[PDB]
Design a binder for this molecule. Structure first.
Ligand SMILES: [Zn+2]
Ligand SMILES: [Zn+2]
Ligand SMILES: [Zn+2]
Ligand SMILES: [Zn+2]
Ligand SMILES: [Zn+2]
Ligand SMILES: [Zn+2]
Ligand SMILES: [Zn+2]
Ligand SMILES: [Zn+2]
Length: 508
């Protein structure tokens, strides 16, 4: 199906959910924490559907459709996705995204039932955090509802009161934290901006200046944007809808559509039929966006295809859409090309990118720092037993590369021509950062002191990635052979830039 990073979240089956490894004897839960991307969402703005509608109107005028039925089908799919996004709101969570996080929060309580029941009895607290963006906060409140209905409401009174709540209403429980959940941009989702001179400002500012001005990234994206296999996929994909004469004139630069009311450059702001720009600002497109090639049209249609997978629940009633009919059979191979072009932009800008640099993923260091600092606060006598964070793909992708999670361990060649491809790299948007992708840490501890050292026993940590138990990077030594539990001291050592292990001292 090739949904790239619009892949809907696949929950663990009852076999996976009940086979998480048990901690070594004597250790019990003291803390858990998570970072999750927001769930499935609609279109970010009136763009892909708007531009293709302009192209469809031209092809209607010029007789460029292959048939009347094909054209009526094309127009009705476009009007359907646009109506669905207008009713749901552009850029907002869909019902599928709410269900994804509801289930994730349900299972989060079930996996640490002993910890949370004890916290309910003993005055422990739960911390909810968000980037500030509506999508992340709303995914959070659905997670929290699943958490509470799984626990029968016994933890509702145990929520830490934020000092900067996401909103006055249902997001009243969520602390805004753009320094660990939005570290990639100077401007924050809530309209504030990072403060010049602070480290969070420097991290976001340096990153944006790097990606904007790096020559290898731009050279590679230009190489992939002119790849002949992508161009042939574009033509064949559009060849099901438009006539070869229409496509020949588009490939010869005789056509061009801007995201305006008439398609021309001199048009004004284009807004989605039935939407209010004061309620729905994103329901109105940026006029600079255009379709100049077969590649643009094809990619816009592919984006409708993958977002339609996200809007499953909204696809009933009078205005339904069926974009998957354009990607059946051997056209699935064409979808593979478009998925690679989409993945490539993410790989080079937010993932491991090319070898010889760490600027694209070192921006995730504040979030890894907070992962370790909240553990430290808990072992040092704090009462927060859980921290649940909700952010974006722009948060998870560098975080996965920074830790070296499966799929984010291979950088592309330092070259503008020998570029990242599906043939030479494991990275895939659908597995690295699906919708509602999440990373969870469980932290256990053993009571008493460790005789022959004046100290308490080190806590141990186990990691779930999209609710799959995974080991840490290979440079890290686990507490025993074949184990996925790691001492906290070891992870402090091996997750730093040196990637050095503590050796025998990492073992229980
Ligand atoms: Zn809440
Ligand atoms: Zn609440
Ligand atoms: Zn660029
Ligand atoms: Zn093909
Ligand atoms: Zn062509
Ligand atoms: Zn053809
Ligand atoms: Zn309707
Ligand atoms: Zn780019």
């Amino acid at each position: 199906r090739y949904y790239s990073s619009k892949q809907p979240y696949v929950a663990p089956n009852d076999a996976t959910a009940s086979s998480y490894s048990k901690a070594p004897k004597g250790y019990g839960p003291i803390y858990t924490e998570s970072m999750a991307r927001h769930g499935s969402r609609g279109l970010s703005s009136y763009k892909y559907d708007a531009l293709l509608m302009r192209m469809a109107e031209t092809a209607a005028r010029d007789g460029g459709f292959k048939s009347e039925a094909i054209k009526a089908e094309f127009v009705k799919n476009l009007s359907g996705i646009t109506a669905a996004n207008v009713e749901n709101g552009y850029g907002m969570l869909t019902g599928q995204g709410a269900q994804q996080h509801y289930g994730i929060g349900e299972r989060a309580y079930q996996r640490n039932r002993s910890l949370f029941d004890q916290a309910a009895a003993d005055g422990g607290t739960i911390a909810y955090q968000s980037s500030g963006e509506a999508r992340a906060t709303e995914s959070g409140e659905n997670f929290e509802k699943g958490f509470n209905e799984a626990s029968g409401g016994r933890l509702i009174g145990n929520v830490s009161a934020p000092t900067n709540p996401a909103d006055s209403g249902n997001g009243k429980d969520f602390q805004k934290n753009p320094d660990t959940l939005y570290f990639h941009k100077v401007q924050n989702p809530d309209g504030t901006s990072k403060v010049p001179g602070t480290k969070a400002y420097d991290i976001a500012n340096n990153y944006q200046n790097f990606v904007a001005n790096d020559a290898t990234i731009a050279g590679a994206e230009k190489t992939i944007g002119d790849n002949v296999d992508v161009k042939r996929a574009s033509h064949d994909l559009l060849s099901q809808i438009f006539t070869e004469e229409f496509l020949a004139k588009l490939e010869n630069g005789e056509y061009k559509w801007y995201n305006t009311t008439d398609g021309t450059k001199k048009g004004g702001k284009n807004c989605a039929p039935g939407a209010d720009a004061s309620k729905d600002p994103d329901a109105c497109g940026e006029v600079s966006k255009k379709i100049k090639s077969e590649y643009d049209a094809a990619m816009d249609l592919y984006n409708l295809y993958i977002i339609a997978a996200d809007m499953h629940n909204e696809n009933t009633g009078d205005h339904t859409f069926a974009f998957d009919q354009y990607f059946q059979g051997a056209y699935a191979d064409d979808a593979r090309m478009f998925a690679w072009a989409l993945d490539a932009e993410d790989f080079y800008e937010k993932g491991p990118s090319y070898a010889g640099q760490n600027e694209t993923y070192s921006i995730a260091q504040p979030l890894l720092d907070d992962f370790l600092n909240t553990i430290d606060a808990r072992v040092n006598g704090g009462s927060t037993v859980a921290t649940f964070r909700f952010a974006h793909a722009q948060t998870m992708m560098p975080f996965a590369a920074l830790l070296g999670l499966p799929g984010s361990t291979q950088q592309a060649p330092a070259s503008t021509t020998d570029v990242y491809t599906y043939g030479n790299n494991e990275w895939r948007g659908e597995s690295v950062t699906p919708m509602a992708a999440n990373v969870q840490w469980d932290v256990y501890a053993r009571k008493g002191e460790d005789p022959a050292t004046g100290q308490r026993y080190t806590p141990i940590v186990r990691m779930l990635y999209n609710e799959n138990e995974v080991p840490f990077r290979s440079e890290c030594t686990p507490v025993a052979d074949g184990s996925t539990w790691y001492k906290l001291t070891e992870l402090k050592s091996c997750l730093a830039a040196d990637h050095k292990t503590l050796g025998q001292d990492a073992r229980i």
